[PDB]
């Protein structure tokens, strides 16, 4: 028969025998018949017995009580109308909006792109970024991550970012919250609510309170929506492309240890679940561009016990395209974006890759900000009179880089009334190249605050 | 059209024809590409295994009652119950020269999508190590298109050198180098993807094409996503496929990539069998596991190919040269599983971080890097006009070191650190710049002969091309002449110093 | 679930369903069953103390320190 | 696993069934045995926190009624005693492999897709004594899921006639 | 260029030969399906006998 | 008899036996397929017991026949052996024809009597500063060369072979355990160079054998020295034994690799808990009796380069002469890289060693030592802020450092320079004169890679 | 130039689909010789096989 | 005001509970609408408790004897 009933369960584990001639295979979608609770096939206990975790409370459960199959993965809406609805991890409404309309779903433990479909090519992937356009440059199918503190819009960042994606490109972008902090999830919805970005989104939280293994999902979740959607492809094929915003793949390791231990398996080495790397792969090589269309992702991280040793950023370094670091002194500057220029670092910084004459002109740049900062400690403990004539131009020259980097956005256009700054590579390249000549030492380190192109620059000049 | 039609007939007239007597035994527990399987006892440990999946299996326990195995693959259309028959046979894969320009499954299936290809000869891929009475020294020379390398830590035929650094520091564009050297000398080359981003295989891929060196060439690769035994068992395979052709008196080269992961999936699943571990989650044999994999790899005996091929040969000693990889955390030489392994290779290269930060590409802690078989494969050139310079230059490194909290310096010191500096600049070069024989000879003369200690610091480089330009063009037949033999005479370098006075005068 | 005894080999087995008396001549006696590195199990002298002295059919010497159930280390 | 825990008591038991020429009687008592094993209601009321080996000792010869022995009688008794009553129903099955070879007549399971006429039977019996056991044993089995043949089954020596070929070499043809 | 060319002519000339074979054999079973021939079946299994 | 498999795991195997025929603990139990043998282990009763193969563990199945010989490993004994390249089994490799020979000796023993051990009071002189200074040698001694991977631990027993081959005259036997091919293939063909060849005999286990052949291979040679310590000369007695061991931490490891598979527990670490014992076991059929002398050396990695793991520890308790190895002195390029202190020698006796040796070698450790402690602060602070003789003891100290610098005969393979024999009374005469101040005025690079004081003269002069 | 051939040779292919559809319904045949020939012949009768 | 007591001589268990009891009695307060406060005391101990009780529940050890379950509560 079609269904089993319970057995036993421990902790979050959860047992059910079946017959011989009917037994599901993994990762199947289990109902418990009489609650809403849900189970997710792990490996087979033999004997008729499967082992499953539930999706939800352990409560109101007892045994004898039947429980079925649908035979099948977890299958979740796919469409464009999931866009502005936040979801559950069984991607059902929480938004209060009324269930999903669309009813095409898909399932999601699915296999990563083969070898023909790596895409065979590389080129870089654009914003409007500076700072990222120039000093990070990212790639489609790009994985980057993130670091930094609190406090410095990291939610306006991600913002301005969908704006461009959706405007320059008609990007698509999705967010998972893995382990949200409830309140600043709310938050958060309600900020992206008053900017419009709300509608070229989709949204689904995994609050950290709730049973490991659906926060443990919702990444495959958020990803097949993601796959759908770049897949998903406009006349004369070639979808667009589409991007991925992770909140803390850390606390996904988290768990992974967590379910790692409720299995009743060995805890590793440093005491992890053995195999993480594994999952890794699942995740990442499961994301990347595609001969046609392309989605990239970049992900939130913590560096747990602040180290580089331990096993999970190690890990994680396998896949980080690039380094995206936020410093705080910068934002106390009043620099917005207040990232950490000089050290942030990404792998796609070759010539051969972003370009001969782009990856001299950065190179020098970087050369010029990495003096400065051997500069400003002797200033500030020798007075700026002490320094050769060259050394102060470069001072000089390096502040107004930092003032040029300080940009306003579309998403600051809304919450103060100014015109945000949309600015291309070859576009930002051009001034900083003839700052390199250093002819604005006339022009006051002033006239780059809150400035776009430097022909913006040089309107400012002309009206100060 | 019909083509296909006959074909398909005549395939189908072909076999089954007949009934078959045969084992099997059903799946009692599952996990993890990790499965149980009782009812079959004419099993052998580690045979292939036969499934209606369509996939395969390795033979792991063979106790009282049941087998526990492997997956090769994937295993989510799997289930308990289902039929799991034995093939009698020990693991295999086709081997051939077929295989060139190819790249495949990690069991030797065309995932190029290319065509499959028939390998006349199948081998099987667990092997043990020949006979030391017909090991042979190493006598013949290996280049790497470097002149860092090349010189200061020869590599011979059949060597085995683990390269050993951290991430985006340099570790594979050195082996790629290396392979591409190879183009013109025709030796047998191989390399293996373990457990990598498929992004820098196709890189990788694309690279070797547009070299066109893809058709000397063979590659397999073992995929980041693959089920972690893929990764563990290909570096055998691909050390068994590389096998056939110093099995046949010729002279081979394996690129092991990234052992590390291959080591840590090892692990895991043995730790899955509820193992106990050593050290760090790792059990003994692992060292065992690498290491016996890493012996297979020599240079042997005509005799032994010989004892091999049993008339089928003339009699030329084979070789097979080793280039594993491992990455260090921080830079952790004295790490556990980097101790083991250097007590296995027979000699090292470490690449220093800082100087590759410092945009020395490649990035040489020539301090630690040693061969033990040194000058058996340099030319007499190169090996007369080595011998102590990279012991020179690294105690001129730690001269360095100490002349920093110290305000006296003698003319020994002073006169070292000078030379120091010139020596350093010499050992540099750009990605994809290999050199002929010439090239870092006349470098290394013009160093030795101070010539270099007189001409700017920064300009040491471009009076390095410039001369090589100077000279390949003046003297073209010169080093023509002299790179194809490799042996020196003094008229030769009285030949070089005369160019080394008029390229300075210009 | 409990796993196998050193107590149960099929000799002693079979002795069980013919009889269920003359315990172990009132273990005066033990008789082998587990062998490795200095250690042996033996079947029988429950009598025996922790810390008796033991004589053996090679004319040797032993100390037991575990009376199980059933079975004895030495 | 069970079946290895099982296996001292197995060979004993037939050693001591041979050794009496009982094991008629043995492997009787051992079905009867299985089957109130496998009864969740008989196995259940077996399971209560109350029963003494001699309980469960008697209980069991009454469940057995006739065909006892003082010798099974001790047999069960160590059984509970070392509680090991649970993989009962292996111990009979391995129990009856261990007379089949030691009479050297082995069971044949066949499985059709029609059904099959005897002088065929004793016809394949005869051609797998060729495989010589000390006698076959004949379990016929037919199967509209078979669509042609007969597959054959000796303990696990198995061989395949039916339409399966066609997915064989279809597997070829790919 | 070349090279590509020609590699996808063979590939498409083998791709082919896998649908092809996947049709092929659906009939050919569904044909065997619908012969119902219980006296083969007896010839064949006394045909086995006599290979046993 | 005979008896058949019946489960199979890693390398460690399982029979039954009929109860009439149990084999003792120690035999060898032929395949009855293949030339594959077993030894047992482990008496699992029930008329099954467990073992371990020797060869391939493949082509193996269950319920496989296997007889018993009724007889330990007891292998091929006598000076027929030498010259030759046997197994593990003492089994021609060289293909030269079986040996000649028909004396078998168990490989198992139990350890001489208390009553049979020998005051081994003969000197050695070597060549090597170093040693020769800090570890005076017992003829009959046990020579041990602590060190990390990579740290030249075959290459000085190479040199050691050199130079000890060439000062003695009689017997030696080398037993290769677990260590790469080409090194000891190598070596075989620069003994035939030699013609003591003869006079020793080859035997290697290595690495790519299977670890069960990786556990008992040392017995096999060591009870051949036993044998020819024990086999007296006529009107006389054994001649001088020449033991060389190859990182007997490789049958340590073994050994763990094992344990549990064999049902054992897990050490501290991971080792076989009779780990101990059996390294006991081992050494004490190891020892030149009131019958001949044996003179053994002992090749010891050290794993991970560290002192505090229970092996290398155990270790110490095993020789009298204790050589170890540094990864900073090698870091620094001097080669050799023996760390002057922990390598230590009980020999080193002021009755015995003569008074100056005695002292001149304290005052050379003292000097050292306060180098050593005070290089923390010279590290912190400027070489200059310090006391002027402070600095002179440092400045000693570097070109102390520098005179032990050596090029070995063997050495000048990776460098080219000719190795060199410094003569003890050179070495004592020349760090006496050092510590006199007699060279402060010597510039210190005039000590490095040298041997004699003369040549330190010759050197600073041409400098 | 690859694509315009490309696709045309698919539209070839097309053609060919049908006519090897009725080319491996002839070739289903060789269930026969799957049998042991059991049945000599058994297809040529029933023709409704005929699919894309 | 109120306070519970979870004294160090009482079984672990209830000071394993107690918290969430507590946990409910203010919620209760928040369910009415209006606001209060509440304070955690000694959850290192609640969590040295609670991994003992695991244990003696032969529950699977975890990192410094934690099963993760213990971040989840
Ligand atoms: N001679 C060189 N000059 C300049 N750059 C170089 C040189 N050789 C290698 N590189 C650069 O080093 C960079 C990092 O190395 P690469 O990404 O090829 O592999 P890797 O060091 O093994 O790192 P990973 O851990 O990602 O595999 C490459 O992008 C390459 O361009
Ligand atoms: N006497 C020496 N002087 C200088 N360098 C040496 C000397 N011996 C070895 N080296 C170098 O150090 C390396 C390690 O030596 P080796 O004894 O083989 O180490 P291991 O302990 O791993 O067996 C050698 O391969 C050689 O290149
Ligand atoms: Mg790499
Ligand atoms: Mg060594």
Same mark, same amino acid.
């Not at chain 1, 001969?291 to 890990?315: F, W």
């Not at chain 1, 103060?416 to 380190?445: C, M, N, Q, S, W």
């Not at chain 2, 000058?375 to 310079?389: D, E, R, V």
């Given at each position: ?75 979740? !809406? ?89 405007? /320059? ?6 967010? /998972? ?48 929506? /993601? ?46 679940? !053995? ?55 910068? /934002? ?8 950490? !220029? ?65 940009? !306003? ?56 | ?156 035929? %059949? ?26 000398? %025709? ?120 004892? #091999? ?46 100087? #590759? ?9 020539? %301090? ?36 920093? #909290? ?18 350093? @600049? ?23 002969? %101070? ?22 063009? @003046? ?32 | ?74 | ?31 009867? $045995? ?43 008794? $160590?059984?509970?005693?070392?509680? =090991? ?13 261990? *007379? ?27 051609? $797998?004594? *060729? =495989? ?38 279809? =597997?070829? =043809?790919? | ?52």
């Amino acid at each position: 028969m079609s269904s089993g009933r319970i057995i036993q369960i421990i902790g979050a584990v959860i047992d059910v025998e079946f017959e011989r001639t009917s037994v599901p295979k993994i990762y199947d979608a289990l109902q418990v018949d009489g609650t809403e609770t849900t189970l997710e096939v792990q490996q087979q206990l033999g004997d008729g017995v499967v082992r499953t975790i539930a999706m939800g409370s352990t409560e109101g459960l007892k045994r004898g009580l039947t429980v079925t199959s649908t035979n099948a993965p977890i299958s979740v !809406p796919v469409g464009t109308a999931t866009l502005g609805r936040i979801m559950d991890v069984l991607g059902r409404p929480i938004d209060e909006a009324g269930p999903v309309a669309t009813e095409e779903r898909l399932p999601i433990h699915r296999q990563a792109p083969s070898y023909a479909e790596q895409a065979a090519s590389t080129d870089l992937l654009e914003t409007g970024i500076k700072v990222i356009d120039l000093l990070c440059p990212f790639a489609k199918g790009g994985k980057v991550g993130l670091f930094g503190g609190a406090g410095v819009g990291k939610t306006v960042n991600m913002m301005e970012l969908i704006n461009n994606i959706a405007k /320059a490109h008609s990007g698509l972008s999705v967010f /998972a919250g893995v382990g949200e902090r409830t309140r600043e999830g709310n938050d958060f919805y309600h900020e992206m609510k008053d900017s419009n970005v709300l509608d070229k989104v989709a949204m689904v939280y995994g609050q950290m309170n709730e049973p490991p293994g659906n926060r443990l999902r919702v990444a495959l979740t958020g990803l097949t929506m /993601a796959e759908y959607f770049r897949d998903e492809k406009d006349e004369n094929g070639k979808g667009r492309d589409v991007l991925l915003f992770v909140d803390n793949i850390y606390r996904y390791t988290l768990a992974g240890t967590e379910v790692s231990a409720l299995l009743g398996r060995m805890p590793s080495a440093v005491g992890y679940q !053995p195999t993480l790397a594994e999952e890794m792969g699942v995740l990442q090589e499961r994301i990347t561009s595609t001969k046609s269309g392309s989605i990239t992702s970049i992900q939130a991280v913590y560096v747990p016990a602040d180290d580089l040793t331990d096993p999970s950023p190690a890990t994680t370094f396998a896949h980080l395209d690039a380094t995206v670091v936020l410093s705080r002194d910068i /934002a106390s500057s009043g620099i917005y974006p207040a990232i950490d !220029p000089l050290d942030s670092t990404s792998r796609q910084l070759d010539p051969l890759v972003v370009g001969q004459e782009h990856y001299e002109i950065a190179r020098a740049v970087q050369n010029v900000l990495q003096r400065y900062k051997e500069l400003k400690d002797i200033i500030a403990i020798l007075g700026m009179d002490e320094l050769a004539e060259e050394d102060k131009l470069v001072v000089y020259r390096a502040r107004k880089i930092q003032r040029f980097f300080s940009q !306003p956005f579309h998403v600051a256009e809304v919450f103060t009334g100014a015109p945000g700054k949309l600015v291309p590579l070859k576009e930002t390249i051009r001034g900083f190249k003839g700052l390199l000549a250093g002819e604005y030492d006339h022009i006051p380190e002033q006239a780059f605050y809150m400035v776009g192109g430097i022909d913006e620059v040089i309107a400012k000049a002309e009206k100060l | 059209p019909s083509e296909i039609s006959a074909l398909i007939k005549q395939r189908i007239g072909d076999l089954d024809t007949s009934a078959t007597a045969k084992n099997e035994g059903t799946i009692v527990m599952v996990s993890d590409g990790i499965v149980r399987i009782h009812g079959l006892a004419d099993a052998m440990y580690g045979e292939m295994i036969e499934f209606d999946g369509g996939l395969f299996g390795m033979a792991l326990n063979l106790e009282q009652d049941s087998v526990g195995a492997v997956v090769l693959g994937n295993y989510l259309s799997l289930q308990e119950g289902q039929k799991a028959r034995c093939t009698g046979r020990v693991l295999e894969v086709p081997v051939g020269p077929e295989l060139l320009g190819r790249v495949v499954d990690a069991l030797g299936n065309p995932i190029d999508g290319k065509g499959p290809i028939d390998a006349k000869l199948t081998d099987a891929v667990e092997k043990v190590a020949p006979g030391v009475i017909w090991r042979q020294s190493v006598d013949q020379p290996v280049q790497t298109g470097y002149k860092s390398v090349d010189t200061m830590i020869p590599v011979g035929r %059949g060597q085995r050198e683990l390269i050993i650094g951290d991430r985006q520091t340099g570790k594979t564009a050195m082996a790629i180098d290396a392979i591409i050297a190879q183009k013109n000398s %025709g030796i047998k080359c191989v390399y293996v993807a373990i457990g990598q981003k498929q992004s820098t295989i196709a890189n990788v891929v694309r690279k070797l094409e547009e070299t066109g060196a893809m058709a000397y060439t063979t590659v397999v690769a073992a995929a980041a996503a693959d089920p972690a035994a893929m990764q563990y068992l290909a570096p055998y395979s691909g050390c068994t496929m590389g096998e056939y052709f110093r099995d046949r008196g010729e002279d081979a080269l394996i690129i092991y990539d990234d052992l590390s992961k291959q080591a840590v999936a090892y692990r895991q699943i043995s730790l899955l069998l509820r193992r106990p571990p050593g050290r760090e989650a790792y059990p003994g044999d692992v060292f065992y596991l690498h290491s016996r994999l890493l012996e297979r790899a020599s240079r042997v005996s005509a005799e032994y190919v010989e004892k #091999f091929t049993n008339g089928a040969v003339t009699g030329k000693t084979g070789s097979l040269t080793a280039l594993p990889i491992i990455e260090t955390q921080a830079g952790d030489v004295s790490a556990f599983v980097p101790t083991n392994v250097i007590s296995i290779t027979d000699g090292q290269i470490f690449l220093e971080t800082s100087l #590759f930060n410092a945009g020395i590409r490649p990035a040489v802690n020539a %301090g630690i890097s040693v061969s033990r078989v040194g000058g058996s494969a340099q030319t007499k050139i190169i090996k007369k006009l080595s011998g102590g310079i990279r012991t020179a230059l690294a105690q001129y490194r730690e001269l360095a070191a100490f002349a920093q #909290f110290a305000s006296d310096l003698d003319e020994a010191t002073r006169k070292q650190l000078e030379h120091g500096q010139r020596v350093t @600049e010499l050992m540099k070069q750009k990605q994809y710049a290999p050199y002929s024989i010439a090239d870092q000879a006349v470098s290394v003369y013009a160093s030795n002969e %101070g010539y270099m200690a007189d001409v700017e610091v920064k300009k040491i480089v471009d009076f390095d091309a410039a001369l090589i330009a100077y000279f390949r063009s @003046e003297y073209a037949p010169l080093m023509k002449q002299i790179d194809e033999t490799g042996d020196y005479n003094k008229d030769i370098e009285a030949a070089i110093k005369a160019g080394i006075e008029s390229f300075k005068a210009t | 679930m409990q796993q196998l005894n050193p107590s149960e080999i099929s000799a002693l087995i079979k002795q069980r369903i013919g009889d269920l008396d003359t315990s172990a001549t009132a273990k005066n006696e033990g008789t082998i069953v587990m062998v490795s590195d200095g250690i042996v199990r033996i079947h029988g002298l429950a009598d025996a103390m922790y810390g008796e002295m033991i004589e053996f059919d090679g004319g040797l010497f032993g100390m037991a320190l575990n009376l199980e159930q059933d079975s004895v280390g030495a | 696993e069970l079946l290895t825990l099982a296996r001292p008591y197995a060979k004993a038991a037939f050693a001591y069934a041979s050794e009496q020429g009982a094991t008629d009687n043995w492997s009787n008592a051992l079905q009867v $045995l299985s089957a109130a094993v496998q009864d969740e209601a008989f196995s259940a009321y077996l399971n209560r926190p109350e029963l003494t080996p001699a309980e469960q000792v008697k209980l069991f010869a009454k469940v057995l009624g006739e065909d006892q022995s003082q010798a099974v009688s001790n047999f069960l008794t $160590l059984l509970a005693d070392n509680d =090991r009553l649970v993989l009962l129903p292996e111990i009979a099955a391995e129990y009856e492999q261990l *007379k089949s070879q030691n009479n050297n007549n082995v069971d044949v399971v066949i499985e059709s897709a029609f059904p099959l006429t005897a002088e065929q039977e004793q016809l394949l019996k005869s051609a $797998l004594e *060729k =495989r010589f056991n000390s006698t076959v044993t004949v379990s016929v089995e037919v199967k509209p899921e078979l669509i042609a043949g007969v597959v054959i089954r000796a303990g696990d020596q198995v061989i395949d006639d039916s339409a399966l070929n066609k997915l064989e070499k279809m =597997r070829t =043809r790919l | 260029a070349k090279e590509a060319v020609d590699q996808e002519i063979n590939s498409a000339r083998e791709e082919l030969r896998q649908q092809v074979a996947a049709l092929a054999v659906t009939g050919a079973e569904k044909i065997l399906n619908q012969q119902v021939d219980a006296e083969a079946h007896n010839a064949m299994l006394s045909q086995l006998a006599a290979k046993l």
